[PDB]
Paper text:
The bacterial periplasmic methionine‐binding protein MetQ is involved in the import of methionine by the cognate MetNI methionine ATP binding cassette (ABC) transporter. MetQ, the substrate‐binding protein (SBP) for MetNI,5, 6 is proposed to play a dual role in transport by either binding l‐methionine for delivery to the translocation pathway of MetNI, or by facilitating d‐methionine uptake through the ligand‐free form when complexed to the transporter. Structural studies of SBPs in their ligand‐bound and ligand‐free forms have revealed a hinge‐bending or “Venus‐flytrap” mechanism where two domains of SBPs adopt their open conformation with an accessible binding site in the absence of substrate; substrate binding stabilizes the closed conformation, where the two domains come together and sequester the substrate. In this study, we report the structures of the Neisseria meningitides MetQ in substrate‐free form and in complexes with l‐methionine and with d‐methionine, along with the associated binding constants determined by isothermal titration calorimetry.
Numbering used by the authors:
A (entry chain D), B (entry chain C), C (entry chain A), D (entry chain F), E (entry chain B), F (entry chain E): 43 to 283
The structure:
């Protein structure tokens, strides 16, 4: 039985090659890894049969993506996840924010929402009462207190954008793969709602191979490796640590 | 030199296999064709180096997609294109439309705009004066004259949607591959703004292989085949007829 | 398991890409399609294991080919099939036939027989009594009533031959892929003996994958698709329609 | 042209996926990465043609390996390299070393030599005067001052060996991929003679593709990435830093 | 450039794997070998494209086969060939032949001819005057002097036939691979007309890869290897030895 | 079940193609053969899963190899084996040996040991009393009686080395596949300790397929074939001959 994984470049792929693959080969499986630069192809490849499982996204992204693209896919288990941070760009500290400061943000709706929530936590904008934080959008801004100019970019552009904007809100996987350190962030997202999940075609939910993959990502050996290899990452809720 | 084409399923892939491939093999090329079900993967595969050229989209789609996804790709030449039509669903004629009739529409922005423009041409809604039809959005509706309920679906769902809605606005490539006939449309888009284009990475624009592909799609032999094989399609503007 | 289909270009490949592939992907298979422009390679590719199944031929062709070339292959199920027609070449109606008129025909024995049977049905030649129609050959001609000159060509060349002969007898798959319409035929073969069959290696006849492929080609969904997409095609006998 | 890289798992593969691949795609290449868990397979895969280039070894290893196995391969350029360290096992500090303490070491000759040189620098053994440090062997030990018991293992076993020996000398690539941190080493190899090299078949040494690969590994952008992503690594001599 | 060879099992395959493949890999080709148990499939696999070159037949076989099966293939160069022999079966010497003795023979026409010519040379039958020896058939027998019963079998069955017939005429390639020694023959065919040839698709006759294969089969190194690996074999006429 | 064999080129591969494969195909298996020209790749391919079984080595080689590379593989059954020989190089007879004569030898330790034992049996060197012949090394030489210069090479180079040294010690498989004859050896190793073994992954040792393979290599039919095809080979101990 060959299990084909798709991940983004970097940390999630290293998990497969450095730990999970050997655990699954012990049980008789072969393992293939396909890495993707972007957040858009992996669910489509999964749904079209080119992958058996992907590991790259949080559940708000998945729920939105599979509804919009009408994909019969579902989350399975969580994985250690590099958290979201607001990082110094042309400006190096939060106190330096000015009226009109620029903040770069990913341009897809579920990750853009995270930026609006962070900016509201910082007091730089104010969101309307009673909104759904997972779908926060420009229409939900009650007042742009500091007249922040939000510069929307494709997610992979955010590390580079630090040259062009005062502050950059950078997804963890792209921060790590560009050599950014999580400790460089001026403000980290407090939420745990965006710890990432693996996803499969719904038809494969009860499969023996997926049971064995799930066990591999929850073993004592994997937890010990993850705590050493991926310091500062947010853990699966089920690890209850 | 191997040229790798990406197209949607059906008509654009048949152009390659039935006519273009042999023309290019005469000049010493080998040809590979990858067919895609959806409109989202092809430009990303092209930009990431897995395809040399794709043939599946119109320029408003390309312009929106390459901006949103930060892709260094560009259009080259036009191809015969199945036109957009409003087709009978539960209701069989335009005169049967009622207050509250349901119309299915694709859920991506550049193709959704075409449905709003079509409904305005039919007099079922009224768009605000002076808005750009290429970016028509719900916000641009001045009055929903017949209180049309627009049912937004992923584009490939639109042929099957005819079972569930009064009328379906169906993209030509999906209509044709589902066995729908262009002559069954109750109304066809009169614009030529959406005749489809091939697309390449910008770095390849001056290549000899692309010159040879361009010539293949503009040869007397290809035109003679296309006029017979794809009756009722909109021809490239440059074909001049 | 990946199922590798081989078909001729055009209609039989579109059946795979537009309908069968998705049905099989729902059951966990992946699908690869290889398209051929000729009639000789597909059964050789099948027998050598480069294909698991091919869809391109009728049973008289298969019976003759597998015996001549010592191939351990066998038919499985029938598929909707474009019929054989006599089409206008230099002359545009049957009534214009003259003594010595030229008719192009395929040069392989089982398809050539079909042309002799057609010419006898038209009253342009007279075949001997009591012959096997599936193997009709020049020796079976009792009288060449109109002194027809039969121009034998490789089957793929028959659309192009219309410039050189008075009438062309063209196999449906090549007529469709060259942009000819079945309704343009001056006369269509009445027989149902040439509805095409899938073929596999005999060793695979009892496989689960082949059972699932057979089911996909006999489903209500495929039948509904075929009746819309391939109007005028001759149906499998087992569909009993 | 497709360039096939072979690397060990982890850091050298991440260099390809996170930085080098995109640099080469801008010049028109596609890139394939094959990752290995051991030190023996990659040069064999290179010599057989499965790989165009590998990145996993130092030159003393390569010189020995290509001579012993009569392989027509050669080094090209250096890459940032995780250094060799002596790490705590059952004992946690250098001055806890006792008479008879166990030290695990790789069992291949060029890497075993490094352990003997390290033990001499620590004063735990004394090597003979005037030896070749690159081929230091047990015969070159003048006195085993602390009666160290050297436990020889296949190199990939050395991270796990920390449970069984007092101290473990672990190659950097395996340390990193097991979640060990370079700052955890009690003593790091001073030498720069084991900064790793890419290798190719000698027949390819003058190729354009290799020139482009070499440029990609010496670009300002790669150096900036490497200094951030791989802190504490030893740099190519040619970088002159 | 991947050169795919097809051979029968045994000696001709060993030539490729032991000597030719390395000669071609030095020049940068890759090589694959497919082996076949029978004489019918290899030319079909060559014609279909699976093979680039085959080595298994003599020219009378090829001339007959490509005409009968309508294949556009051609001979290129000769190879050292195991000769044809009449071997002991139930009877152990030629002098033991009796009226009615049974002789097994291959059942394909060009190899059956060789048996008739051999039986005529032995004085067991008498062929008619002025016949073409390459096409000698039962119709060409003037008198069956010893009323030999010729038992026609598939060529591969002839080594095993020795249990069932008085004498067996066995093709060299099958003799060698069944553990028979050429010195065991009671009578060996004198002719050199059946020294075997490589064959290719005619389209490939002027290719550079074929020039390089031809050189490998005619080098001083290959001749030295063949003279002792294949003792008793008949050499290419062009070697003029 | 498809059983994948790996062998060195030549004799061990012919055993599979000419006898074993058909014996296993009669029980319903399919068989694939991968041939190697070196001694290092086959156990690595076995351990990685590319092969199910290999046939190329003796047990002293296997024991050393699996320990050095920490591979979980094990021997199963013996096979007829071409013996080790000392062959003429620049000198043609044993009596011509001189002080300083050169003898080429394989450079791997378990095969090098065999050379030293052979040279001691010949009286050209003198090994120390009582040393383990399986691990004989240069340090076990008491006196180099004839000041032999031993030229160590990778094993596959040893046939060609005959141009450069006075005498060459060549492994049987390489002697056969280079067109050397075993009967032309000046001295053949008499020991039976190096009759070769098949090897598998330890996890497969109790499999049904391996039981069927073992039976195939010990059948009366295989023994009869081997004694004809491989004259002068050393037989498996289990054959009790
Ligand atoms: C594709 S959704 C974003 C995933 C990314 N790893 C994150 O946690 O921010
Ligand atoms: C991806 S944009 C839509 C393309 C489609 N062929 C059309 O013309 O409607
Ligand atoms: C290869 S036999 C001919 C097949 C063709 N599709 C026909 O029905 O005429
Ligand atoms: C294969 S030689 C050892 C290579 C390893 N990356 C090191 O620098 O220690
Ligand atoms: C396929 S023709 C027969 C070939 C065989 N090698 C022979 O020389 O007898
Ligand atoms: C790989 S160990 C050497 C094997 C060789 N066939 C021999 O018996 O000498």
């Amino acid at each position: 039985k060959e299990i084909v994984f798709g991940t983004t470049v970097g940390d999630f792929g290293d998990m497969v090659k450095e730990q999970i693959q050997a655990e699954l080969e012990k049980k008789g499986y072969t393992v293939k890894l396909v890495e993707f630069t972007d957040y858009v192809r992996p669910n489509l490849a999964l749904a079209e049969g080119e992958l058996d499982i992907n590991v790259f996204q949080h559940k708000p992204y998945l729920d939105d993506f599979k509804k919009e693209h009408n994909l019969d896919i579902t989350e399975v288990f969580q994985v250690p996840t590099a958290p979201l941070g607001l990082y110094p760009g042309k400006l190096k500290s939060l106190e330096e924010v000015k009226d009109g400061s620029t903040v770069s943000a990913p341009n897809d709706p579920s990750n853009f929402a995270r930026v609006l929530v962070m900016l509201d936590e910082l007091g730089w904008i104010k969101l309307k009462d009673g909104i759904n934080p997972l779908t926060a959008s420009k229409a939900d801004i009650a007042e742009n207190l500091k007249n922040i100019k939000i510069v929307e970019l494709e997610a992979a552009q955010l590390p580079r954008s630090r040259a062009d904007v005062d502050f950059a809100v950078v997804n963890g996987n792209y921060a790590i793969s560009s050599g950014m350190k999580l400790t460089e962030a001026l403000f980290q997202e407090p939420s745990f709602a965006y710890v990432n999940w693996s996803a499969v075609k719904t038809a494969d939910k009860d499969s023996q191979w997926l049971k064995d993959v799930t066990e591999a990502y929850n073993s004592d050996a994997f937890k010990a490796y993850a705590h050493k290899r991926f310091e500062g990452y947010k853990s699966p809720a089920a690890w209850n640590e």
